[PDB]
Amino acid sequence: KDHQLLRYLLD
Amino acid sequence: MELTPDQQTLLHFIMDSYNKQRMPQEITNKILKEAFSAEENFLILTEMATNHVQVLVEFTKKLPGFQTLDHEDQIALLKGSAVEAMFLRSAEIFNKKLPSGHSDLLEARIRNSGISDEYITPMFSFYKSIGELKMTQEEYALLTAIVILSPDRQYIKDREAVEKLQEPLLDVLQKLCKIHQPENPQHFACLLGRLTELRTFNHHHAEMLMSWRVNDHKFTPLLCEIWDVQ
Numbered sequence: 347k348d349h350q351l352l353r354y355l356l357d
Numbered sequence: 358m359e360l361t362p363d364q365q366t367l368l369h370f371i372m373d374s375y376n377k378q379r380m381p382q383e384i385t386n387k388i389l390k391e392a393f394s395a396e397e398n399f400l401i402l403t404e405m406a407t408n409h410v411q412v413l414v415e416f417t418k419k420l421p422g423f424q425t426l427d428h429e430d431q432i433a434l435l436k437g438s439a440v441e442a443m444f445l446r447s448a449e450i451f452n453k454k455l456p457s458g459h460s461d462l463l464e465a466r467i468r469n470s471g472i473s474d475e476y477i478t479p480m481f482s483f484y485k486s487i488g489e490l491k492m493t494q495e496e497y498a499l500l501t502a503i504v505i506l507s508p509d510r511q512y513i514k515d516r517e518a519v520e521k522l523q524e525p526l527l528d529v530l531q532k533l534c535k536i537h538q539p540e541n542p543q544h545f546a547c548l549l550g551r552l553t554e555l556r557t558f559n560h561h562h563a564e565m566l567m568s569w570r571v572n573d574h575k576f577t578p579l580l581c582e583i584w585d586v587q
């Protein structure tokens with residue numbers, strides 16, 4: 347899925 | 358009129374999280390020390406922007422109630438604010454007091470960094486307008502938090518949940534504007550007006566970066582996620 351690094355940093 | 362004990366707690370909390378950013382002195386010392394090529398300045402920019410997004414996610418996560426938001430809305434808020442937050446932090450760095458002549462050289466070095474001519478002028482127009490407001494460190498911290506918690510971002514499913522988190526920050530900022538500048542009752546409105554000027558930078562950011570006078574425009578996988586690049 348798109349924004350996988352952002353989602354990772356957020357979680 | 359004055360801040361309540363809860364508002365004082367909120368302000369100090371926001372300030373501590375905000376202060377975990379790379380020091381303005383670090384950035385300006387590097388630019389002022391020696392002139393770099395457009396190739397070297399493009400790479401300095403991408404490294405600065407990658408570190409900034411990383412610290413911004415950490416600051417965002419600490420904003421009261423941010424963790425209670427829908428995960429898709431959390432991503433929408435971060436992606437919608439990252440560029441504006443970078444320009445606001447650049448405006449803060451630009452307006453920090455330096456020895457006589459240093460800010461003139463800093464401006465001249467940024468004008469000749471490789472950035473296209475058409476993007477230079479509105480950037481310094483925004484930086485100098487931010488400077489006239491003579492904002493305190495607390496005002497930049499709260500305004501960054503207000504920028505991140507904007508309920509009017511594209512793709513937000515639950516705007517009211519975002520509104521509820523932004524409202525107490527706007528209330529603290531309003532009280533601070535009346536305390537720091539009691540002679541200027543327009544100060545709070547001026548700050549909010551500066552946020553509308555901030556939004557203009559989103560529309561042309563990708564073009565601004567691709568117009569940089571370099572042969573190849575290499576970005577980090579994280580910058581590709583936050584910016585409309587590669």
Ligand SMILES: O=C(Nc1ccccc1)[C@H](C1CCCCC1)n1c(-c2ccc(Cl)cc2)nc2cc(F)c(F)cc21
Binds near residue numbers: 399443451466
């Ligand atoms: O580092 C930077 N910005 C930054 C990023 C993230 C976090 C903090 C700052 C860059 C430099 C510019 C000169 C070449 C190297 C990068 N930068 C900018 C700027 C930001 C975005 C784009 Cl698209 C163009 C310029 N405006 C600045 C004002 C300052 F007082 C200044 F000191 C540095 C500034």
